[PDB]
Write a protein that binds this DNA or RNA. Structure first.
Lengths: 202, 88, 96, 115, 31, 65
RNA sequence: GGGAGACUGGAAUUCCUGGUGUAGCGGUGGAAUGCGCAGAUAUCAGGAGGAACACCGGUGGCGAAGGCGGGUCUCUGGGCAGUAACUGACGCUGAGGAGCGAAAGCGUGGGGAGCGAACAGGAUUAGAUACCCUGGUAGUCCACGCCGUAAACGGUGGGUACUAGGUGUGGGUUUCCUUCCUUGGGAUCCGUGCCGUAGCUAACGCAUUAAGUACCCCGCCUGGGGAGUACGGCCGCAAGG
């Protein structure tokens, strides 16, 4: 006995042998019932194979773990083992952008020509570039430029080292530019390529 | 357990001589004193089963020591039993 | 007679100049119980880590006593009964 | 009223985010929820819904005289990152960030595990 | 060892327990 | 590794009164630091934990500030 | 963190009260029952109550086993090391027997925040007496008592002597590097893991903590179902053992 069914495009076929028509038909019915049971594909039959939980258990379609670019190096012995002080000679926006480009660094901390204040430039994404100052000033006071940039309206706040690390952790930005509470001057912390924080100071 | 002074006085009163501390008479006396103290404790804390097991161990050791004494010298066994107020 | 260390925190409203005499009277019972020895040190008016009984500051007193356990328990009961004592804590300066 | 300085309370659960701006004496002055910005069901658990709710709450605090705020995050991470980013992006200055999540000292029995 | 033996034993014990539940009152009235 | 500063010949005694000696042993969140990150022996770690808990009970250290 | 009793601390959940405050909150793979518009959720302040003790915290400690960590006090058991003062074989095992014995369950009296068998709806399904969601009674808790079962497992009864080592870790004594700070290293006794000889095993594997080499005592097995069931008996308030 052979049976073929077209369940909504899915072909389910079965074949049995028997000593007579009745036994063969009954065995074929049992076989087809088992096949259809294994075919269901509705939610009740596909709910135990869907990946569950967050970290426990792993499956082929389980969501891959989100990994940051930096080595983890958890808060335990994170430390600050990179302190650059590249340049604080005054520069203009275009000169700061060129100093950015060959350094291959997404953000860069310099001191502005017109203001005399510390500033940090970074890639503003599709909007162009973005400039952040210790005290926000308009474009007219800022030295003339030709690159299309925008200025962040918020000021760099005053806060401590541990508070800065906490803000960076809870705010998830690639860096934090701030005026140090104890030092009173500019500082840019970024998570390094080894898991430590890179604190750039004057 | 007992303090040093109680042990000293018990050993002095029941010890065969002024030095012995492991003689079966002295051991039996010390075990009996410990047993009575543990009984007085357990009369208050009925549900302290672990100390009750310790009491059972002490009782068994005292019984074995009395067995040894009665096997070695009957008169010493009678004297010890009558002096410490034990029944069996 | 065992040694004990009692740390008490009192409310800050009452004057500090009366803390040492008043506490003295609180020890009088344990002084008359069994011939006990006391050493009182006071370093008070310190802000607490957390608010205790609607209070932020407190007066800290340390008493080193050598007395019987029953006497120390009775003294602790009296100290807790007093309304001018925010908290008490009794430790044994022995091996324990 | 006019409250130049206030606080921001962000509760980001696994299926909703609630943002409330608060006069520092603890009085809510303007709140926006994930479902209040047009989302419903699982859609309101997304970070984008948290962004919209945070921006709406920021505007509803800004027209009330709030200029500088400090944020108190709370709850398992669903859209906290985007919530604070949107709070900043709507012209509301962020003073400080504090993680105040109710952490029991092993009290109460949690519900039985799902399967 | 394989859990097949345990399955057989648990099935037997379960059936006996169900029988006891079914005839508890009758056993009490005859006992 | 690190040194059990108490097993040394200059090891200060562990008490629940001297608050600085305990503050140096708890993290910035107020939690008790692990033994490995500290390196003290098991007995001294237990004494430190007991002293920290006692000081918390007498309102000398915050309960997770 | 061995056990019992007493007192007591904080975070958090729930509820109540009073402010600010609006239209959603909650829940899922997706939703709906449900809560709210009579003012919910959110936020602050105050109050009440119950249970469990984050960090320390581990293949780490204690206990015969079950098992045991918020803090302090009182009472109490056991173990280890050194000296070897003391007694002088007083040792081992143990049929029956007695005691302890997780959780669930039963009785009397309290307590009841969270969780939650049973029970209601919601959802999925061809059907859902289920898995998922919203509620939720016994129970989980305390006191005094019962029961006497567990994958009560290391699936390995107790005691002793011997048989290559290497390396973690807990406790205690001591010699030499010697700063004598230092897991310095060595020696030794008592635990607790990993790897590995000989040897044993059907194999997997065990391997000084033997499943190796031997001695003493106890318990248990004699093909699978029927069956740890029937009858009889003992115990139990009952479930049942």
């Amino acid at each position: 006995a052979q049976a073929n069914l077209d369940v909504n495009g899915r072909q389910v076929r079965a074949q049995v042998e028997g000593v007579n028509a009745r036994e063969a038909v009954d065995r074929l019915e049992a076989r087809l019932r088992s096949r259809l049971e294994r075919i269901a594909e509705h939610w009740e039959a596909r709910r135990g194979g869907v990946p569950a939980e967050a970290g426990r258990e792993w499956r082929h379609e389980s969501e891959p773990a989100r990994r940051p670019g930096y080595f983890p190096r958890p808060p335990e012995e994170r430390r600050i083992i990179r302190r650059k002080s590249f340049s604080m000679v005054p520069c203009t926006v275009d000169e700061a952008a060129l100093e950015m480009e060959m350094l291959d660094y997404d953000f860069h901390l310099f001191t502005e020509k017109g203001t005399g204040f510390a500033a940090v430039l970074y890639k503003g994404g599709p909007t162009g570039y973005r400039l952040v100052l210790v005290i926000p000033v308009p474009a007219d006071e800022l030295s003339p430029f030709e690159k299309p940039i925008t200025i962040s309206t918020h000021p760099a706040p005053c806060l401590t080292q541990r508070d800065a690390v906490e803000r960076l952790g809870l705010l998830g930005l690639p860096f934090l530019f701030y005026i140090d509470a104890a030092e009173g001057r500019a500082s840019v912390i970024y998570r390094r390529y080894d898991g430590h924080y890179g604190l750039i100071t004057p | 357990a007992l303090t040093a002074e109680q042990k000293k006085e018990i050993l002095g009163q029941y010890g065969l001589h002024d030095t012995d501390t492991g003689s079966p008479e002295a051991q039996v006396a010390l075990l009996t004193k410990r047993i009575q103290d543990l009984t007085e404790h357990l009369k208050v804390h009925k549900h302290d089963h672990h100390s009750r097991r310790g009491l059972l161990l002490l009782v068994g050791r005292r019984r074995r020591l009395l067995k040894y004494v009665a096997q070695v010298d009957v008169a010493r066994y009678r004297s010890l039993i009558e002096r410490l107020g034990l029944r069996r | 007679m065992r040694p004990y260390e009692i740390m008490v925190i009192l409310d800050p409203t009452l004057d500090e100049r009366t803390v040492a005499p008043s506490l003295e009277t609180f020890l009088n019972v344990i002084r008359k119980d069994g011939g006990t020895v006391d050493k009182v040190d006071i370093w008070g008016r310190r802000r607490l880590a957390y608010e205790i009984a609607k209070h932020a500051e407190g007066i800290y007193a340390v008493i080193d006593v050598k007395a019987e356990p029953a006497t120390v328990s009775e003294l602790d009961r009296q100290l807790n009964l007093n309304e001018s004592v925010l908290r008490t804590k009794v430790l044994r300066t022995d091996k324990h | 009223k006019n409250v130049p300085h206030g606080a921001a309370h962000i509760k980001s659960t696994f299926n909703n985010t609630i943002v409330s701006i608060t006069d520092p004496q603890g009085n809510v002055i303007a709140w926006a929820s994930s479902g209040h910005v047009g989302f419903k069901g699982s859609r309101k658990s997304t970070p984008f819904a948290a962004q919209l709710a945070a921006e709406n709450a920021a505007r509803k605090a800004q027209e009330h005289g709030v200029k500088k705020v400090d944020v108190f995050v709370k709850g398992p991470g669903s859209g906290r990152e985007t919530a604070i980013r949107s709070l900043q992006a709507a012209g509301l200055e962020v003073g400080t960030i504090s993680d105040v999540t109710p952490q029991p000292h092993n009290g109460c029995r949690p519900p039985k595990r799902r399967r | 060892g394989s859990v097949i033996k345990k399955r057989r034993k648990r099935m037997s014990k379960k059936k006996h327990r169900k029988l006891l539940r079914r005839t508890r009152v009758q056993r009490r009235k005859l006992g | 590794t690190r040194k059990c500063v108490f097993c040394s010949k200059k090891g200060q005694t562990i008490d629940y009164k001297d608050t600085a000696l305990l503050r140096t042993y708890i993290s910035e969140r107020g939690k008790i630091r692990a033994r490995r990150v500290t390196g003290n022996c098991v007995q001294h770690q237990r004494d430190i934990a007991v002293a920290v808990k006692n000081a918390r009970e007498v309102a000398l250290l915050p309960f997770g500030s």
